[PDB]
């Protein structure tokens, strides 16, 4: 399918269409303002992925453990029996907590890499 | 602290707040022009980091040696007894020289990587 075709699919299946939605994210004064705001939004998301240490990746694994309080569902339950819309609602209240942890994790990684590189 | 809280701190301590200022870099016709110019500036800095081979990193080590003519201070003197404002003034006259060297270093690295990959 095309843009948002996987919206009703399970979380697992929809991960194979991540590039389709990505391509459609970027694709008289009020109209120009709208284009400028769309650009700023896109850049804010790219900057956020940069800060976390993901950069140009659509799937990015991290070192932040799952708290289990954010969601206590089984791994197969989440990936096989839920859509992304349901998941986004389910953990909306913890989004900023997760983002904060991701930023801190990358900062420690960068310092450790620098110190590892400093060894002769 | 928050945005620019580390401005008066030593160079070492301020490196732990690099993400805070980064987040605040992106955050009627004249106002729209101002937003467009802010976007162009941001992209120019990101392109420059890309050319140097750093991409999505806040701390990036390189292969360009320090000339010692640009600054002859001790490593601990620079990192423990100076702020970033003082440092920026101290080496302002050598900024373009350093940038040129960084670009050349990455170009050689890219060719060497390509030739290393070409080996069967």
């Amino acid at each position, epitope marked *: 399918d095309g843009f948002l075709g996987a919206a009703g699919s399970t979380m697992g299946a929809a991960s194979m269409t991540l590039t389709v939605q990505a391509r459609n994210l970027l694709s008289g004064i009020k109209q120009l303002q709208a284009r400028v705001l769309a650009v700023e939004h896109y850049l804010r998301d790219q900057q956020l992925l940069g800060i976390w240490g993901c950069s140009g990746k659509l799937i990015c694994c991290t070192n932040v453990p799952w708290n289990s309080s954010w969601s206590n569902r089984n791994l197969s339950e989440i990936w096989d029996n839920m859509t992304w819309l349901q998941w986004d609602k389910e953990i909306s209240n913890y989004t900023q907590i997760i983002y904060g942890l991701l930023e801190e994790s990358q900062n420690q990684q960068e310092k450790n890499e620098q110190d590892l590189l400093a*060894l002769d | 602290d928050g945005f620019l809280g580390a401005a008066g701190s030593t160079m070492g301590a301020a490196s732990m707040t690099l993400t805070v200022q980064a987040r605040n870099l992106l955050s009627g016709i004249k106002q729209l022009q101002a937003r467009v110019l802010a976007v162009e500036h941001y992209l120019r800095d990101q392109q420059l980091l890309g050319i140097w081979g750093c991409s999505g990193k806040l701390i990036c080590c390189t292969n360009v040696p320090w000339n010692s003519s640009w600054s002859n201070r001790n490593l601990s003197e620079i990192w423990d007894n100076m702020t970033w404002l003082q440092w920026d003034k101290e080496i302002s006259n050598y900024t373009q020289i350093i940038y040129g060297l960084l670009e050349e270093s990455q170009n050689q690295q890219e060719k060497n990587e390509q030739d290393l990959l070409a080996l069967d």
Partner: antibody, heavy 123, light 106 residues
């Protein structure tokens, strides 16, 4: 002025475990890398383990890589080495020392700057 | 491990050299060959670091150098209280952090 005192256990049998902790004073603990060095009763010195100043990045000698854990608490000014298995060849006087590494923004060390008195671990 | 003479001695006041010999992957490649003095019953203390550097508080009679894969410590003006077990310690890179030599009984 600067002091390091090792505290730990005595006689351990093979297959057990023993935790050895070094207490530091007289300097900023969090500003220096720490390491452990051991001396067998009839031999010279050998390096055992190294931990950086933050404590997140550690290195070990291969002979103890799967047996010893090195950690530090910079708020408690405490360096701890938790040893497992403890073979007969591990009997030695263990010392904690300041030095052995520098976190990129500091001048190079690659030497052990300050040594404690040591504690004898007998298997 | 690094090779050191089992025993070194000389007359009081004489300049006595204790050598330490390694290989190209350690003493040769890296100019980080420290020296320690271990008095019997005491913990080692740092005497020399890097190649030619001396810690503050250390007498100027202790000095050294490096040539090829051989490092040496020279103690001028030998005193009765200088007889201790001396060790060399060389940086050997990231895979092997430090290598100590056998002790020399001065």
């Amino acid at each position: 002025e600067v002091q390091l005192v090792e505290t730990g256990g005595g006689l351990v049998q093979p297959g057990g475990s023993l935790k050895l902790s070094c207490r530091a004073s007289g300097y900023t603990f969090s500003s220096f890398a720490m390491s452990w060095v051991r001396q067998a009763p009839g031999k010279g010195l050998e390096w055992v383990s190294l931990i950086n100043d933050r404590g997140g990045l550690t290195f070990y000698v291969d002979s103890v890589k799967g047996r010893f854990t090195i950690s530090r608490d910079n708020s408690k000014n405490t360096l701890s080495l938790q040893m497992h298995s403890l073979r007969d060849g591990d009997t030695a006087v263990y010392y904690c020392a300041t030095g052995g590494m520098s976190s990129a923004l500091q001048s190079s060390k690659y030497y052990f700057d300050f040594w404690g008195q040591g504690a004898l671990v007998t298997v | 491990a690094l090779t050191q003479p089992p025993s070194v001695s000389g007359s009081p006041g004489q300049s006595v050299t204790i050598s330490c010999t390694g290989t190209s992957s350690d003493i040769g490649s890296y100019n980080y060959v420290s020296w320690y003095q271990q008095h019997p019953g005491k913990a080692p203390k740092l005497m020399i670091y890097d190649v030619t550097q001396r810690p503050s508080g250390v007498s100027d009679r202790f000095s050294g150098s490096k040539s090829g894969n051989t490092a040496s410590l020279t103690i001028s003006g030998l005193q009765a209280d200088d007889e201790a077990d001396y060790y060399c310690s060389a940086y050997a890179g990231r895979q092997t952090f430090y290598i100590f030599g056998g002790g020399t009984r001065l």
